[PDB]
Amino acid sequence: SFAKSKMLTYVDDADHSVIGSSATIQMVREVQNFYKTPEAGIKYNNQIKDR
Amino acid sequence: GIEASYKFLFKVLYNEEVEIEIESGAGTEYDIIVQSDSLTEDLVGQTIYTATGRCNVTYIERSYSNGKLQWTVTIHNLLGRLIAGQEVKAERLPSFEG
Amino acid sequence: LTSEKFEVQTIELYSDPTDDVIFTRDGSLIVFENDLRPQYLTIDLEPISQ
C-alpha cells in the first residue's frame, strides 16, 4: 500500500529544511484497448469520490 | 509431469516406444494481427476460431496503425489455417466480433 | 461509433480516492519510476523566508 504520510516523511528528509510538505493524490490506471473494457475490470480499490 | 517426461517414461517402462502428445500446451508461437473493437483484454487464454481454423492466444500486445484498432496477438498451437477476411469469433465472452 | 474515428494514444482515467492509504490487491502494483512517465510529478517549490 502507498501511504501519503509515509512518503511525506521521506520528502521531509530530503534536505535540512524543507519545513514539511503536502500533496494530493490522483489514482490512475492506464488501460490499453479503450472503447470496450474487458467485460469486467478497470478495478482500482479504495473507492474513489463522486464524479 | 512436464512435457518430455512422457518421452522419458515410455522409453523406460511401457514398451520401448516413442511418444508424442498435444494439448493446448506449450509450443511455438506465431504472429497474427486482428482489427476489431470489443477486443478488450483477458481474451488471452481463450480459444479463437474462424471458419477455417481454431487456436489459442498467448499475448495480446497492441499494434499501431491509423484507423479501426489493430492488435498483434501472439498465437500458439494453431490448427486449421486461419486466413485473411475471416470473422474470427472467440469461443466465450462472445462479444468479440472482428 | 466505429473505431479509427478517434485517435487516442492510450488512455489514463485519473481518479481521486476517498482514503489516502490506497491499497492494492489481486494483480496490481504502484510503480512510481518517473523517468518513463514524468506527467505525475509537477512537484512544486514554495520559497519562503523569515
3-state secondary structure A1-51: CCCHHHHHHHHHCCCCCCCCCCCCCCEECCCCCCCCCCCCCCCCCCCECCC
Q: Which residues of A1-21 are buried (b: 16+ CB within 10 A; e: fewer)?
A: eeeeeeeeeeeeeeeeeeeee
Residue C47, min C-alpha distance to chain A (Å): 10
Per the listing, cell 473505431 goes with C3
CA distance B43 to B78: 16
3-state secondary structure of B79: strand
C3:B68 CB<8 A: yes
Total residue length of chain A: 51
Residues of C in contact with A47 (CB under 8 A): 17-19
C-alpha cell of C34? 518517473
CA-nearest residue of chain C to A31?
C11
Resolution in units of Å: 3.8
Order the strands of the B70-79 sheet from edge to edge.
B29-35, B70-79, B54-59, B47-49, B89-90
CA distance B16 to B24: 26
3-state secondary structure of B37: coil
- Other CB atoms within 10 Å distance of the CB of residue B75: 18
The answer to whether B76 touches B28, Cβ cutoff 8 Å, is: yes
CA distance B96 to B49: 11
φ/ψ of A9, rounded to 5, equals -80, -25
Q: Hey, which residues does B32 pair with through a beta bridge?
A: B73
C4:B37 CB<8 A: no
CA dihedral (B76, B78, B81, B84) in degrees, to 10, reads -30
Nearest to B68 by CA among B40, B95, B97, B37: B37
3-state secondary structure of B24: coil
φ/ψ of B73, rounded to 5, equals -95, 135
Residue A39, min C-alpha distance to chain C (Å): 17
The answer to whether B77 touches B27, Cβ cutoff 8 Å, is: yes
CA distance C10 to B62: 10
The answer to whether A38 touches B41, Cβ cutoff 8 Å, is: yes
Residues of C in contact with B69 (CB under 8 A): 3-4
Residue C7, min C-alpha distance to chain B (Å): 8
C-alpha cell of B37? 473493437
Total residue length of chain C: 50
